[PDB]
Amino acid sequence: SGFRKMAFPSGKVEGCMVQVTCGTTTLNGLWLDDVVYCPRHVICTSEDMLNPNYEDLLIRKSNHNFLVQAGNVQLRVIGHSMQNCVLKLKVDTANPKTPKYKFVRIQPGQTFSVLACYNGSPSGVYQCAMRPNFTIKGSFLNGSCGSVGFNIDYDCVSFCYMHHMELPTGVHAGTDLEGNFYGPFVDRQTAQAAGTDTTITVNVLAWLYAAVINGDRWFLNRFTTTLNDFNLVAMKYNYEPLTQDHVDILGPLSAQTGIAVLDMCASLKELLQNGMNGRTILGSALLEDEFTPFDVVRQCSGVT
Amino acid sequence: SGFRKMAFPSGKVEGCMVQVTCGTTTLNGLWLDDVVYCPRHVICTSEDMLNPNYEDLLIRKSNHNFLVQAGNVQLRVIGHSMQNCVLKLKVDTANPKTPKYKFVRIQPGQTFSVLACYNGSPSGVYQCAMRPNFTIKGSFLNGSCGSVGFNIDYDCVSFCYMHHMELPTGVHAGTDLEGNFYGPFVDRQTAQAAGTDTTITVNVLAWLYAAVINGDRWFLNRFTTTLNDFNLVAMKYNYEPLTQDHVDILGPLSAQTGIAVLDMCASLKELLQNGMNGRTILGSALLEDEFTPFDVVRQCSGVT
């Protein structure tokens, strides 16, 4: 028993982190097969970031200007190309530690682990969720760009995120591994305000099921609701509308606990309207939304 | 910016996890050099756990009864010995992935990362603290015994914890890598109630400094206090007494922010007496105590 905000083991991704330096800028790259992927803003100075013309800036760069270091050994760059907001540097050596991998573009509400790195060296790992406004609330200092987000299914790493920017409000923005930003963000140092950070309702419900499984049951009540009634309260509290697809995804947790999804929605409705009253659920004083239903099943069953 | 509950990258420890089976019991072992370390209760059935005589149970075990598997390859056991509550199985092959390591016995209030494993396979990584009552609040299912806790200093892994038991109240107990339990716990399935789970004051203060550094400043007030006055409030709220040693440890964070330690204690005193009033600090609605001052400095400076 016990329920923790757990990240995937990071070893398979640690084996892929490299340092990329272009001029005076150093950030992280991801080395998979004979390609190194990194944010294209490695070619910018902080001055360039105000209004960068990436195609023009890239014309002044040759393969030998991209310094790629894996541990203490230098990799030879034999080609480079820009794909959306990522640079791909072709190297002459395939990464011997390349795991089985895929590039996936995640949906808002989905979770993933981040291996925060500096100078191609891993510093820490934590579990994130793609917010409904397409930002992530991470822990990224200068030099962390190029750190990646991923999920692991047995031995295959699905890379879903690469860190690019910190918005003026301290939230983070980045791309998938094809270089397309999540949300409306751009790799320019300009006013980029995020939209409403709504709560991922289906994840809060999954976490309430984890709480019931792990013994925390005080919030269970004698009520039920309907999707439409629940959604009237969800709107008021900036929660994402719950759909029948979300109810279906929560089916296995409902079956395991014997608590109908709409009964759990009624517990959540009361928690929203009445608050916690100074109580906690799974060691939290707020309703946690960075565990998907799949995460709850995985952690509660011990998937390796 | 941003502050997350971050675990150390787990790759160096993933390379050490093996599966140990004795009879019908399977748990995890830690393979370092030519020794595999695992909980001695791998020799017990659930029936034996009620009143186990470990020395007597161990007489019926020979080297060939301990099945050690590293991935899909079997390790040959050439010796075994019991050291306190851990079994050490000497194998004929040194682990080629053995990192630089130390065994350390941590103090209550110290944090570490846990690589939760099942059948010698890593499932997830999370950050824990040794509670003042010598329990940990982890995420451990049946089969997780032998999963380890550690800290990493550049390239050296300091192993500090091995999981052994889940107390009847859902909290966890375990040993250091010499097999000595933290706290008064024993490896017997019996009534083992934990003492008061007090809050680690120095860690809450470190986390309030992290909040100030990362922009969350609403809780800063116009007051100061003394250690003795603060400790009168700490006692009332089941917080650990703050010592001059704790004040000294917070010195670097006080210097960086310009907030005197006792001024931060006065902010904490007001937070204890008045509550959060529905507000959050670093995305939390409670006062977080599983970041040490060293963790805050490390994460806020990007140590790899």
Ligand SMILES: C[C@@H](C(=O)O)c1ccc2c(c1)[nH]c1ccc(Cl)cc12
């Ligand atoms: C950066 C990477 C990529 O775009 O995948 C890359 C970049 C350049 C090349 C590449 C892969 N393969 C080549 C084969 C022939 C020639 Cl003339 C150039 C290239």
Ligand SMILES: C[C@@H](C(=O)O)c1ccc2c(c1)[nH]c1ccc(Cl)cc12
């Ligand atoms: C389990 C491990 C340990 O106690 O470290 C171990 C266990 C048994 C032996 C060992 C290390 N080295 C030996 C050298 C000679 C003989 Cl006769 C036995 C052993």
